[PDB]
Amino acid sequence: SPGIWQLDCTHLEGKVILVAVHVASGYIEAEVIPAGQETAYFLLKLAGRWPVKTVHTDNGSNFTSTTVKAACEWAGIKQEFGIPESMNKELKKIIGQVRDQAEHLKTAVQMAVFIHNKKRGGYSAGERIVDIIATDI
Amino acid sequence: SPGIWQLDCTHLEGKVILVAVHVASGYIEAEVITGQETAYFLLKLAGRWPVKTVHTDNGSNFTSTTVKAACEWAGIKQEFGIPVIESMNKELKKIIGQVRDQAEHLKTAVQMAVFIHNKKRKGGYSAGERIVDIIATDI
Numbered sequence A: 001s002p003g004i005w006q007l008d009c010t011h012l013e014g015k016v017i018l019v020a021v022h023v024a025s026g027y028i029e030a031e032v033i034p035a036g037q038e039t040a041y042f043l044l045k046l047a048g049r050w051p052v053k054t055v056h057t058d059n060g061s062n063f064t065s066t067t068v069k070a071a072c073e074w075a076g077i078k079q080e081f082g083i084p085e086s087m088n089k090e091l092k093k094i095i096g097q098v099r100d101q102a103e104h105l106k107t108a109v110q111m112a113v114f115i116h117n118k119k120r121g122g123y124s125a126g127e128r129i130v131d132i133i134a135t136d137i
Numbered sequence B: 001s002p003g004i005w006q007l008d009c010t011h012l013e014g015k016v017i018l019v020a021v022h023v024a025s026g027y028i029e030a031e032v033i034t035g036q037e038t039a040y041f042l043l044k045l046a047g048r049w050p051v052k053t054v055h056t057d058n059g060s061n062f063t064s065t066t067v068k069a070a071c072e073w074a075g076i077k078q079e080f081g082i083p084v085i086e087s088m089n090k091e092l093k094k095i096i097g098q099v100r101d102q103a104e105h106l107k108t109a110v111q112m113a114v115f116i117h118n119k120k121r122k123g124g125y126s127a128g129e130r131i132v133d134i135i136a137t138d139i
């Protein structure tokens, strides 16, 4: 799954966290969003950094946004319904383990992303996605 | 070596664009932005790439308490002086110029310019492929 991703939302402290998972590696990026333009922005930034070819979502929210459709078209990203899981739950453990170390939840979110991608034994999620993309190239 | 980065500022439209360059590849990340803002940008970068040394060539970043709690937290060394980013800024700005009317917010135009810069080929890999080849090789 070189450029296959999936995009979910989770919630903490009355806020929305947008979570992209690189399916084959477990690598993740996340960001605190309001609910539209900011998902399109998130997607464009992801696509500039990694190969992003197919993004799966499991509801209709993302199919009803003209800015998200514009970003998909601009960057060549194909939006796909249906799931190609527990990191919303694994991410939230880590956020909690670290929440007291930052004022802003969003900082705690990015701390948890860091720990998730860097840990793990053999290869970590961050090393996997790079291994997966290196071989492919 | 794979974890060397250069950090600088540039400006368009009354706004500040923070730019990180992966020195060995030319790969770039940017954002419109300070103190906490740069700390956040750094923490996110380091979560995604190996970030071991960040070079800057001015004093601003050495005066931010938050920037450097982030340095400590993520294990990033902040050195003064350059080990590419100013001709980079002139490139980033040309591309921003070509797309500026394709988005409402400068933030978006900036990120489209990042995408183009990282995805295009100088045949022979793009910046995005080189930073990955460089990091793959290292393991």
Ligand SMILES: Cc1ccc2oc(C#Cc3cccc(CNCCN4CCN(Cc5cccc(C#Cc6oc7ccc(C)cc7c6CC(=O)O)c5)CC4)c3)c(CC(=O)O)c2c1
Binding pocket: A037, A038, A040, A041, A042, A044, A067, A070, A071, A074, A101, A102, A103, A104, A105, A107, A108, B032, B036, B037, B039, B040, B041, B043, B066, B069, B070, B073, B102, B103, B104, B105, B106, B107, B108, B109
């Ligand atoms: C075709 C196409 C394609 C793509 C497109 O996209 C868009 C579109 C959009 C659109 C709109 C609005 C907004 C947006 C972006 N919004 C997100 C931008 N970010 C900026 C910065 N902000 C971060 C922040 C803020 C405040 C404080 C901190 C902090 C901190 C901190 O870090 C730490 C690290 C370590 C430690 C120890 C400590 C710390 C600490 C301190 C502590 O916490 O203790 C960080 C967050 C937000 C985007 C369009 C539409 C168009 O344009 O046409 C479009 C079209």
